[PDB]
Symmetry: D2
Subunit: 295 residues, 4 copies
């Protein structure tokens, strides 16, 4: 037998950082969960019990805190790239670092219509994420994403004209509820190294904002022919607005809300045009994915 692939590191490292403006007294907080996995010439730790090649996972944890202390942690694309680069430069035998960062929302509170200097609220479990793969001699590959954005529209969704055969019971519809949890990922062109990532820093927050805005607007405004058709429209627009993105991927559950026939009870009318009360279904759910790139 032989080691075909191996990676190891530290997962679920929670980090908080505060920035304090001495002049204005305004404080800004960042909270993330970080995972770092390393690859390189480490096979002997598996095959020969040779621990000399192992950078202890506890040391990786220390490194994350030290790096957060000495560098900005925003945008996460930059922080991930700094953190990944550290390991390949510091350790001769480590040749790849894989950094995943989940950013948690701490939104500044408005008290009496004014932004509070040091108080924050978690407005939703929506996350902004990055995956950064730093590979020695092959640059920095960055995938940025948003996830956990949960939306619903109560009309202006249709689904008709699908394949009908002996397995089909679903009725065609011209008016249904559409609800999903959005997972959207945009993959950046490969970067040669940290200097190049630094040169593009302003694009990271702007592109996240654009992806979010396009997702929300398209969902709200499209008279949707299917999840497939609506998600394609989203991806198309993102690619049009940021030339440094190579591909956009969406993964969307179709969270079903079923009509409830109440006609058995005193002829009560609750279907089609008369539908007011619905039963949200926890499972099963449709799952629709697509990756869109450039012609």
């Amino acid at each position: 037998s032989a080691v075909k692939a191996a990676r190891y590191g530290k997962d679920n490292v929670r980090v908080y950082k505060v920035h304090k403006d001495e002049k204005t007294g305004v404080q800004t907080v960042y909270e993330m969960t970080v995972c770092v996995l390393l690859e390189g010439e480490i096979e002997t730790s598996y095959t020969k019990a040779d621990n000399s090649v192992i950078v202890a996972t506890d040391s990786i944890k220390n490194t994350i805190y030290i790096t957060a202390k000495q560098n900005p942690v925003t945008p996460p694309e930059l922080f991930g790239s700094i953190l990944g680069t550290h390991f390949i430069e510091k350790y001769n035998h480590i040749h790849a670092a894989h950094v995943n960062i989940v950013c948690h929302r701490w939104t500044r509170m408005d008290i009496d219509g004014k932004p509070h200097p040091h108080s924050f609220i978690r407005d939703s479990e929506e996350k902004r994420n990055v995956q950064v793969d730093v590979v020695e001699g092959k640059g920095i590959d960055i995938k940025s994403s948003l996830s956990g954005l949960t939306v619903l529209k109560s009309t202006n969704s249709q689904f008709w004209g699908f394949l009908r055969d002996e397995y089909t019971t679903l009725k065609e519809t011209w008016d249904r509820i559409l609800s999903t949890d959005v997972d959207a990922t945009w993959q950046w062109k490969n970067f040669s190294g940290l200097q190049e990532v630094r040169s593009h820093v302003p694009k990271f927050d702007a592109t996240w904002a654009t992806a979010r805005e396009v997702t929300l607007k398209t969902f709200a405004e499209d008279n949707s022919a299917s999840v497939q058709a609506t998600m394609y429209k989203m991806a198309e627009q993102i690619l049009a607005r940021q030339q440094l993105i190579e591909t956009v991927e969406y993964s969307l559950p179709n969270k079903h809300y079923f009509e409830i026939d109440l006609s058995w009870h005193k002829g009560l009318q609750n279907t089609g045009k008369n539908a007011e009360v619905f039963a949200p279904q926890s499972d099963p759910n449709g799952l629709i994915k697509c990756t869109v790139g450039r012609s």
Copy 2:
């Protein structure tokens, strides 16, 4: 042996309702999870296998949908009272109904600075809840609550002057992070029945809004001496603003964020005045409760 207490019913009933304004085209959605448990002269179903006394839990589920179809589902205090009253009036041998409702957020989307007619976002997992106990001959008792409101302030929290003995290692502090998930419950004076609940309908949404606002403002503005002192200030204000509330209860976890000493690494300074990077602790957590009533 004898049956000392018994209750049964249906839990986790998900319900969605849409309201459509024909004039404006604006649609408004409500989504809830409902639990109904009944008590009464049902001992024989346990002791003698006498099912004749059982209103099937499946029928309770049907009743929830039918009641939602025929009545407003907001404010939840009113809907819960209608639903509970139904069971005690309909069934001679049922003498109490216990209704719990969790309301999920579907917040209208703003697209290009304008409210969208039929598109919604789940902005946070904060819930608005009610517990309604309808007891034949004893009226309607309603406890309203908010939960899952997660907040953090990065300064203006202190904790010093506590008891110190041979079990104590905690250092006094004049500047710490304070973060909690707020669970706040206000208990209404007993209502004689549905007519009285209906007469107070406007107070329910207003009091929820007031409780939320007082919680957020007090948290943001108090230079907190402890969780205990800050939560008391919140409860005091709520009681002052709504005379129909008898008691307010808060239950607050103290979600700890620990300093990280980095001095072992090149004398790096990250504690006290120099603290910038912290380690959020998932467990254990302080838990602080109090119930405040009128003198």
Copy 3:
């Protein structure tokens, strides 16, 4: 306003303890999650920012570890009583301690038909729990429980003869699946203090074992007329076997498995006597409770 009730302490304190037999080399592990909440003359910490009355929650955490170091942690009824008693004896102004303990399963592995001296498996998320309330001048009240015991029987469950009215759609049945997650609690007679709890130590593990065995046997063997009837039979037997128990409470979800009519597809027969494939329902679920005591 006035403080009507108040309690505070530390939740989610994870503890592991190992016992090492020097003679045999056999090691035995215990893992628990502990919560301790205190009450007493602590109102001024809420109303006057007087922290002098507060035993810091961090100190409570320390106390749990120290107490686990110096005392046996099994049976949990004894450990909880020692821990609770400590606070009321140590602190003049603390008059009640509320201790909740959840015990996690670490079951000794059998390797080649032999018990391994120091290796363990988590066989299921079933828990053994205790709630101990130590109240100065009123002794020690202990509620013991098991929870998270998930079972299913594929036949020998019926449900017919229930109330039928205009809200009822459920068909009577003489053969259905019955599945539940068992939560069972037995409440001990009040104990005067630690000496009395110590005197009954052997009864705690034996009664837990009896409760588990009676639950499993009755579920497996009863030709069940309803959840209500079967659970009553369980509680009856437990009370008969341990005179020091005052009441037994069961809380049982009815986790539904629905027939799937496949007759629309080539006349395929999958209902009633021909039912083979079913759809487990995640929600809603029946919830049935009862508390049984002595005549």
Copy 4:
């Protein structure tokens, strides 16, 4: 823009099947959660709102139930292969089916030392899983796995001789707790189609059993030099016992249990040789992976 990749289908489809032996009266239950995603000539549903190419996800759900009705559901490798093959044979324009199956434990109860004919217990949340990719013209690729197997050993684990530099604080150790949740995957040689999968049916359950047994025995018996070294030993043995496996992958969290220094309290000794009480850490955790194949 262009569609680079696309797949869609139904997730979280819960299925239960019962088998009834008419002769012995013994019943056996199977419960699974199934996901099916399809690929093929479906781009136009995304780009042109052409639903004619879409096999509705609701129809996929129906197909899963119908297939379970007409075929054995065990071993899951066979069921997944039948289900996947169905879609590529039935639909001209569908060229790949991806089937994931999670099997839930329903273990027959022993009542009074005898196996009960129709009563079952969920002994642990350990799962047996399969991933089956059926690709037209490229056969059937099957990855089998077990997951959620949680184990702990209280001694006979060491970790010393790792890299030490200015980022390192971890002390070397010759005696520590080792605990993990095992995720192990074995990848089968490619199969040409259903006939070949059928020909190997007995190997599927046997190999699962072997993987489980080797994992447990090696964990219990290895005087572990690291997670890396122990997991390699496991994978090596599995590959040696089943020639039809091409690779074995393990992914193991290192769930840390920390010593608690209690010396500040009356010189209490709780570290090194005297360590009895430990603090399980919920996060962060080491994560160690490796894929082992044949020389």
